[PDB]
Amino acid sequence: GGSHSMRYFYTSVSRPGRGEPRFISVGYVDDTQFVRFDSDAASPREEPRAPWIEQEGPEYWDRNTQIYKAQAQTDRESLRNLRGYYNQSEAGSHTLQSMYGCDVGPDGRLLRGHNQYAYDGKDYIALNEDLRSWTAADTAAQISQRKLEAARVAEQLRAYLEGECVEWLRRYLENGKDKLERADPPKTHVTHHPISDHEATLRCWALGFYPAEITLTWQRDGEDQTQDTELVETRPAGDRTFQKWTAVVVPSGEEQRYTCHVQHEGLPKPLTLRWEPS
Amino acid sequence: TPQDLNTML
């Protein structure tokens, strides 16, 4: 869809027997990262990770650096509080993750806001879709919920998500127009790997596409085959494009019985293709 | 731009 999203991802990892936790933040527009912050650096600062964000003046970088530093010390507070809620000891390392941001439509208007938290990898507490209420995972999360409700944090978050989030996302989308409004279709092709004197592997490749969302399907005689198929996770090529492939094991001949189907944005119509041998 | 908040849990 012609929609867009912006997302920040915070990871705080406590360090027992030592000092401040490690705090890292990254920001994405859709599947394109554009900023980062790492408390471990010598003098930590928000840093650009995309061309179209370097245009921002130093007020931007100073403000965001200060935001990340304050968040890091606060996350330290949150980590020792949560350790208290669960009666865990001082010896272990623990992780607090935050992810938040906004999905907007082609019109630039807001479709959905998000702000949720995980503790040691598990859903801890999340702002509901109405941007006015919370869903807690357990009773500890309800301690946190009473704190967030008393401080009316949901209204602050709704202000940010309906305000700065969408406005700055529209600014980013306009400034990185070429790189963010693009949809690179996948360059696609099928390969053949004989594993026996009758068995073989039929692998369908999608390379160089953007964004990461894609669906590959194997169809035996034009009929959904999902049996002894291998489907690897979508993976980054490192040049801001993505790669994926799916494989099916196939007996003797009858390779032409099988078809791979590729659904992706940048494609005008879905793609059907078979092993074209030589 | 990140949220100009330091929420605590």
Partner: T-cell receptor, first 112, second 112 residues
Framework: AGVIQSPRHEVTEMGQEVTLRCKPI?????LFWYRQTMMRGLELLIY????????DSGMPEDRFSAKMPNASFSTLKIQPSEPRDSAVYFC??????????FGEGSWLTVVE | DAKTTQPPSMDCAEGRAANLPCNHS???????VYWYRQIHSQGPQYIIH???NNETNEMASLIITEDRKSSTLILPHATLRDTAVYYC?????????????FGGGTRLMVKP
């Protein structure tokens, strides 16, 4: 109770260390130190939120130090006091985005 | 930063309504209008605040225009205890704007 501040009055010779203490309203997570003089009226010295110093741009560049060791106690200290430090120092707190409430202040006259 | 402007002084007759104007033409959508007052050698005292809708409480009523660019604090029946300096303050919903920045205010004198 409201914001608790002490000392309410302090008359002390220059060159001493001055310590002003504040207890925010129970459960409030934000705390502000303000200075009030004739020349400039009320001026923000420092703003803490959830025990973390957010804005200390108003703090004098020397001799002034503000701390918040726990959610229910904060100090403003003036390392060697000087007569120009004379003013009323107000502590305020708030619970999230509810209203900010002010203490009764510490009236400091640093005397030559 | 201060975004409000007020008349430096204003007089009101005891038992009459006091209409205290305030301009804030650059106010943002995530910014509330607060009104505080300070007597003499006392800490500022919260009066009232609002976003878009007009608001009332035991002390005052607050009228915010449709375009939000100005507002009026209304003391419906001034008493002698209402003589004070009245501050109109914008307060935003994030850390850049969560503190109060005090301007000149309006010195209101209630005439018996």
């Amino acid at each position: 109770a409201g914001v608790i501040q002490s000392p309410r009055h302090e008359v002390t010779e220059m060159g001493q260390e001055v310590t002003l203490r504040c207890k925010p309203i129970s459960g409030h997570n934000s705390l502000f130190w303000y200075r009030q003089t004739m020349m400039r009226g009320l001026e923000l010295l420092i703003y803490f939120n959830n025990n973390v110093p957010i804005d200390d741009s108003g703090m004098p560049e020397d001799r002034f130090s503000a701390k918040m060791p726990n959610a229910s106690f904060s100090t403003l200290k003036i390392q060697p006091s000087e007569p120009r430090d004379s003013a009323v120092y107000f502590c305020a707190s708030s619970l999230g985005i509810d209203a900010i409430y002010f203490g009764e202040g510490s009236w400091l006259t640093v005397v030559e | 930063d201060a975004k409000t402007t007020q008349p430096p002084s204003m007089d009101c007759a005891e038992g009459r309504a006091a209409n205290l104007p305030c301009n804030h033409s650059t106010i943002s959508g995530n910014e509330y209008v607060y009104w505080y007052r300070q007597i003499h050698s006392q800490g500022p005292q919260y009066i009232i605040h609002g976003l878009k809708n007009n608001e009332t409480n035991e002390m005052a009523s607050l009228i915010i225009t449709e375009d939000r660019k100005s507002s009026t604090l209304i003391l419906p029946h001034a008493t002698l205890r209402d003589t004070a300096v009245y501050y109109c303050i914008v307060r935003g919903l994030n850390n850049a704007g969560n503190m109060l920045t005090f301007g000149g205010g309006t010195r209101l004198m209630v005439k018996p």
